[PDB]
Amino acid sequence: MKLTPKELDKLMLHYAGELARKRKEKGIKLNYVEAVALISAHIMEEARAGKKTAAELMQEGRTLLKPDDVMDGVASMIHEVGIEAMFPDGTKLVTVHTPIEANGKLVPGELFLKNEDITINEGKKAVSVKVKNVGDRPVQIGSHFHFFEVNRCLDFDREKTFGKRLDIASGTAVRFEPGEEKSVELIDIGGNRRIFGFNALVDRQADNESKKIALHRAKERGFHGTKSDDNYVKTIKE
Amino acid sequence: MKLTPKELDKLMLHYAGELARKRKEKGIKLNYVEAVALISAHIMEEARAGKKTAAELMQEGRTLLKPDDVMDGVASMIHEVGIEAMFPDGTKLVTVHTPIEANGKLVPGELFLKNEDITINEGKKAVSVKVKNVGDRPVQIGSHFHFFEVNRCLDFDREKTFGKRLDIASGTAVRFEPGEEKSVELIDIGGNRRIFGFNALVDRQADNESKKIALHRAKERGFHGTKSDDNYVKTIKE
Amino acid sequence: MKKISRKEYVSMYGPTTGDKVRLGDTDLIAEVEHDYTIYGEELKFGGGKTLREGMSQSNNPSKEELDLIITNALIVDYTGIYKADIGIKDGKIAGIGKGGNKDMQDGVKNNLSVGPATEALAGEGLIVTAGGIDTHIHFISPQQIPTAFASGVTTMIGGGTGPADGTNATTITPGRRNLKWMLRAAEEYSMNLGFLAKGNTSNDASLADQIEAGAIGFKIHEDWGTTPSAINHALDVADKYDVQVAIHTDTLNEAGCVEDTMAAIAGRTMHTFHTEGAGGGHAPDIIKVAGEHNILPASTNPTIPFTVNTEAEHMDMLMVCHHLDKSIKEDVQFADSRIRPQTIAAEDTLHDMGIFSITSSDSQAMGRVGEVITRTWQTADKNKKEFGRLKEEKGDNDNFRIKRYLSKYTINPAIAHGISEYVGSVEVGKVADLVLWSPAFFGVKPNMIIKGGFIALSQMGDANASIPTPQPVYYREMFAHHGKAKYDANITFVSQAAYDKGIKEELGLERQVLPVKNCRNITKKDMQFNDTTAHIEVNPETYHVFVDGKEVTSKPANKVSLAQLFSIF
Amino acid sequence: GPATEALAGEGLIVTAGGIDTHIHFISPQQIPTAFASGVTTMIGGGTGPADGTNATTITPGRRNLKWMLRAAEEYSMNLGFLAKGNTSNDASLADQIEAGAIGFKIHEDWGTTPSAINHALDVADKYDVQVAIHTDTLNEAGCVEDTMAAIAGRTMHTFHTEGAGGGHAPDIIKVAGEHNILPASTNPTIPFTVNTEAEHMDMLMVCHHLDKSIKEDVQFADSRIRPQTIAAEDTLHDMGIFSITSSDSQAMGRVGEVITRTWQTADKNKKEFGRLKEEKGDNDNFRIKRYLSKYTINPAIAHGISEYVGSVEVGKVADLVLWSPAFFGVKPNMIIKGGFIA
Amino acid sequence: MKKISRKEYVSMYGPTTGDKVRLGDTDLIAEVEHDYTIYGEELKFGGGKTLREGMSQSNNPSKEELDLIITNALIVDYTGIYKADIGIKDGKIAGIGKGGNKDMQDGVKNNLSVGPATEALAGEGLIVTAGGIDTHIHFISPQQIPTAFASGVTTMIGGGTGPADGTNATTITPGRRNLKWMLRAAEEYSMNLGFLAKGNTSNDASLADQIEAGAIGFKIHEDWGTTPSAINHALDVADKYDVQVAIHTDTLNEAGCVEDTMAAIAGRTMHTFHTEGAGGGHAPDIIKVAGEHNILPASTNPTIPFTVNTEAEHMDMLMVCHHLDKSIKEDVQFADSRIRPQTIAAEDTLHDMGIFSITSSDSQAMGRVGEVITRTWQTADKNKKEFGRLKEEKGDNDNFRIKRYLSKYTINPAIAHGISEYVGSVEVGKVADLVLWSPAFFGVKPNMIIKGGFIALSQMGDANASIPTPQPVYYREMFAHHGKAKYDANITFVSQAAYDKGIKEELGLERQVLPVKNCRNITKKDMQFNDTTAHIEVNPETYHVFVDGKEVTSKPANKVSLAQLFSIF
Ligand code: NI
Ligand code: NI
Ligand code: NI
Ligand code: NI
Ligand code: NI
Ligand code: NI
């Protein structure tokens, strides 16, 4: 047979699903493990039969278990069942999203939230800058990127954005479609304001003296919207 | 699924029992392993169903296999099947005692005994002492405990019991219910008669000289039935 | 300055101050007390997120740069329930707080600096607790260790040599040679380990030799003879060597009753196993010692919570382990004096009152090594269902009860066995033995175990899958579990005397070897959230339990949480 | 002589052990799985099921390198670890190499910026180690030509160059024609099948926690998958433009399927385009050599280990795989590791 | 439960929460913010008091038993002004809090346990601060070290080889051999010491060699030529070695003006000496750099506070040190451009605003080594007299201003020179460099110095007297000052590179040798209570100073506190 470790794991999973199906036949309401295993084993068998596509199986995994077939609390615990199955065209990942609908009131890990909003970046004044993507490719910018050093294809008044980042939720992003034009809010970067990396445009302390060096470097490297005055005077370290 | 090692072991056990049940359906007489597994898997499934109590399952495990369903010799080899199952109220141990009745003549490990009795403690003369438990709690005394140093709530003529133990089978015990009164047999302790521990009443060689020290210590510590004469004369080491 | 709705904020970074989360499928509600974060500066890992070179990873890091940081973790500890980032450096917890890059963010201290040497572990929406500590292990089979590991236990303390009959009854590793056997076997495992010696002797030299041979304490078990003389001698030696003593008292009252045992203890520190007495102990009134100042009272998980199936199960279990016969009236009399559904019922309430301070296993010796934490939280849930919310609560939460029950298997056993300077809590300076829980699975099935500052166990899908999530998912050994890495991640606890004599070098041990300390000067008042002393009376006839004159009882449960919803078997 | 053991190979095929250079060290169980498929060397990074490792093949820093190097003593596999290249601090980069790493990974999840690329390449040139890159899909700091300018004509090993696994949308695949680039592909995109696109779409929606009701998430997903580049990737393998096949294990890739999917791609290409014009005879020997090099000798040359492993040559380490021809490319007979059966 | 009047309670144990105490003869009022004590459980030493065997000294101590405990101390630190007990173990601060015996008292943690090995130091009615740190020492005479020690300074950082003319001008220890001379001489003294190398060179190899030879940083001084090239090279090497750079800029504007110097610094971390410029610096506008993020601005004590005698004294002092002549108009022009009573007046207000962050000496090089702390508190008192109470105060006290000025010589210089993990504050884990002050003498004359956890200097009466109090009382060396004990109590700070190369063993040094760290990634925002950045403009003609567009000035004082009331000379 030359079974691999994967084949042994999948055989164990198939028989866990078989046990789940037997218990469902006996009239027992399935718990979390049984529901997960039943969905996974059904998907594997369907993929072995070779008569359905992976997308069909993603849709079919959601009709196996009605809400009355599982215990209270089960539906809210199974966000997604992923299972890798071998189709005639090879191994594909099938994920079923929210296979079971909630019918009871039991929610394990239920979150009870205050209805008050969170104020982020408190004490930081936000300026508004209009930005246009003159390139032919999409550009996405995160919350803590130094906005002065974004893709050179974005065009905006770079001088007003030095030492600033997007005033959005941490870990979120703003997208710029090709040709898209929109305005964004920028707050000052906090901490020691020591900007290293990002395009190597600053790589030092952020201040008015280093803003001139950054503007000159940006203009030399073709960053759009950069207007650094001609007759630039170099310093001893650039 | 987040299966634990216990869940993998129980899944293997369930399918061993499934194989046993299939073979029983085919008409094969089950052997030792198959009978054990069939009983265990039935108990686990019943506990999963959640409609029966553990005691009900202990009684039900004895009706699964008739004597004609197993091979000769199987019934005498299965004294007790224990299995831990998860009920709605948690994990409980279910043990089935003598699930199958013997019908053949084959007894593996059969013992062929001489009909002569064993004489224990030969050469030891036994005295008889009457003991009463004046406490409100049960007291149980083993075969090799120094009977002079038993629970102080037991009342008996302690002087006659010094250096002695119960003349009963090794590893057995005599029980004294609260208020119970009965007589017991005591033999001399053998070997070097060096008594250490038990209440720290002797902690030295047992003899007439140390019996006086033991009696005095017992009286000072309120051991019932101890009559050591007043005007006790201390020794240099007590 | 922007406004973010609480819903999307919690979905991105987890609950914040004032939010509440249900623990598992129970009724216990945890409220976040405080948050160490600066709103708008949260650490997120991923594509286009903050944890990147020059933004939240420093390009000029401090010299105390972290090896590992856990971002946006909800810490559930006896010290509080709060949100922070946990930084790990060199196997210890280096910092708790904001975490990040000082070049671009305001409130970052040198001990929480993220640099190029830092690994990122996302903890948003997850709970971090300390690793559990099980102090009643019968070392009967090595397979117990992975089972306890997968349930959230990171330290096992006990005794035994294997499936020998002495070990099947007692948590005792007897003598220098057997201690050497077990200490050299311990090099195999992903678990903190310490071993108890035989206390059942009246020979002081024999007692002292076992401590100097590497044991962290004594077990006194009635199967080896729990007599006042042995108790007295063992306590004297333990006081000379600063190690703990555990006791399984005489159920038969052979040498005396419970007060004689207390007289032998003579007001010295003692750790009592299965104090309610179903697991052994003076019939029927061993449970009264749980109110004494010098006693550290523990319970074993088979008796908690009290259910409809508990009594019959314990009766049949006792008839099997002691080879009793139902046709003998003396065996029945022994069994009836032993089980006592009254004391079993009282035990749950005594846990709720803080009289009992430690939960433990008694593994494969009438106890389940993979169920200590689960049965502790089942008991907490049952007590909240019966008696309602505790009066020591401050707010519409169960934070006080959560701390009380969490201490029973994390910090109180660590204090009891003199290891609370290394493990037991999420505190700066302590060993990074941490467990990650998703709140929906809290108390029954963890996400991953961090052992010695490195991941040792986690849920994991099949190795050939394109991502780690797909089925089948079960607990698999991680890299800290293998090779020479396991020697750096694991501790063998020994006595101070053995440590000073170079037990590590004498036996060629490659694990970390640490001494236990501060075992003799602790009392019931040193247990966190479980320090209630009271006068406990037990009726000799009806077996009823009275605490400070009032009867204490609980009713059995026909169904518990965290049981059939989460397990296939 | 009398000291020789005999192994019969009549009717069997001997190839060199496979070399997988895109391992996410997420679970130790990957190592036996790759071993059973014919892989004898795994190169990559990670510390375990941590989120940083689930995204990146990075073992960050001296202490984590020590952890993984001491864990490696467990396994039957040749192992080497990549450090974090995503920093602009030269001292931090150099310390990781001196701590035992064989190279750097630059991954966009730690920030693939031109500054970090430039610094990492400078340090790697000073220490003679390889650099692997997972480029910026969002074009945040620049497009593909800006990345090539940061590389500045130095040797670079590109992972999943076709870009479904990440990379400048939509045109990272163009770097596969450059002289200084060593272009690799990951196995989930080869061969291109009817189920490939939907599977990759749903996989992307899961790993990045995207929502179908958000148009920006859809726009990101559409710019990322591109069935056009996936289709082109198979032909580029047939043409010799792509040079290395790899896994991206448990990070959109299957560690036990590198060799199998390589030979599936070869079979599909022969079915579509017929026999190669570089053949000499009624055989496919040239195509067999071309595809076999993708997981044996080319990754070994790329990561500087081709004097030890990568081929059946005298003087090299005896990492050999025995195949019965009926099972060639999917299920081997035995693995010889270090001159002994493992 | 008994009631005690506040008066007798404070007389017995010192001020408690809500009480206020005057600092010296100034107008600054300190309010106790919090108390760690349990009322009725205070630690008192004496006949019939609590600190006795079995009551507050434990008969069963923890294993972390203290060597020394300071009872009922009022801690004045940047972390707060509060009452606690300070426990010292092994030269470090082991605990801050209650302290005592767990057998007889409730709230005692293992790190604050008093046992038989503990020495008692009474601190009731006394103030405990961290030892001062002086970072502008000209090592001109060894006699400076006892003088600074007696004023409350426990760490001296600077450079020099002795009364050589190069040292009389610069804080520079030039080259490997001179570093070896000074490092071996340092073994004599009761002071933490670290030495600055010559930064005035354009040779990178020469710069690197000095750091590897044991220097903790560079001094750039105009007397050796403060040119942009040397500044650039020195900063590059310092960034490679993680050491601090201090600069005395070009007063003559020979190679450029202040903006050229800032361009040479190029946004890297720099510590500027006497930033107001009377001690040297770009005339007349060096003071403008005190608003930059990357600058750590320090002032020297001769210019603070500004008084009626300040200008004439500085003028005549300048005419003497530079050998100027009053009949030469060019020398007068140099002197007038140098002194500038306008900048001197502005400097006091900039200290009050938090623009200046560090106070230092410039010892025997226009500065007084025994007056840094005294002149800092004189400046604080003068500023409170002129501008009133700060608006950042919370209550009828000056706690915020006290913290702001105390940081100028304790924690900010320690952060600036990368030693704030060892010294600088009263925090657990740090070196026990502590100063005891009676509040009546606060800021001018301390009671005793604790160095490395042992008493090194104290007020003391004549040796033949029956008690330690009678006259004459002056500062005398204690036991930590003598024998081989001084090697355990004192630290020589070196660079990480020198430490890794075994500088201690190569030079045969018996003092503790510790590496400096985290010098390059700190900015003005890392200074405690002094992190105010602003745009500072100086008028080229009138020399007026404007901060954020508003003129900043102070008026001179005709009389200061802490001067003639406390000293015979
Ligand atoms: Ni027990
Ligand atoms: Ni036990
Ligand atoms: Ni990638
Ligand atoms: Ni990858
Ligand atoms: Ni100067
Ligand atoms: Ni100076």
Residue numbers in the entry:
A (entry chain M), B (entry chain A): 1 to 238
C (entry chain N), E (entry chain H): 1 to 569
D (entry chain R): 115 to 456
Task: Provide excerpts from the study.
Gastric infection by H. pylori depends on the expression of a nickel-dependent urease in the cytoplasm of the bacteria. The ure gene cluster is comprises seven genes, two of which code for a nickel-dependent urease (ureA and ureB) that hydrolyzes urea into NH3 and CO2, one for a pH-gated urea channel (ureI) that delivers host gastric urea to urease in the bacterial cytoplasm, and four for cytoplasmic accessory proteins involved in nickel processing. Ureases (EC 3.5.1.5) are amidohydrolases found in bacteria, algae, plants and fungi with an active site composed of a carbamylated lysine (KCX)14 coordinating a bi-nickel center. The overall single-particle cryo-EM structures of H. pylori urease reveal a 1.1 MDa dodecameric complex of 12 UreA and 12 UreB subunits in a tetrahedral arrangement, in agreement with the previously published crystal structures.
The map at 2.5 Å resolution depicts urease with BME bound in the active site (U-BME) whereas the map at 2.0 Å details the binding of an inhibitor 2-{[1-(3,5-dimethylphenyl)-1H-imidazol-2-yl]sulfanyl}-N-hydroxyacetamide (U-SHA). Briefly, we used the program Relion to obtain maps of U-BME with a resolution of 2.55 Å and of U-SHA with a resolution of 2.09 Å. We determined urease IC50 values under identical conditions for BME and SHA as 13.5 mM and 19.6 μM, respectively. BME coordinates to the two Ni2+ ions through its sulfur in a fashion similar as described for BME binding to Bacillus pasteurii urease, however, we see density for only one BME molecule, whereas Bacillus pasteurii urease shows density for two BME molecules. Nevertheless, BME and the hydroxamic acid moiety of SHA assume similar conformations, probably driven by the requirements of Ni2+ coordination. The structures of H. pylori urease with bound BME and SHA display the same overall fold, with low backbone variations for subunit UreA (below 1 Å), although the C-terminal residues A228-238 show slightly higher root mean square deviation (RMSD) values (below 1.5 Å). The difference in flap region positioning appears to be due to the bulky SHA imidazole and phenyl rings that would sterically clash with the side chains of Cys321 and His322 at the tip of the flap in the BME complex, with both residues fully conserved for the 260 GenBank deposited H. pylori urease sequences.
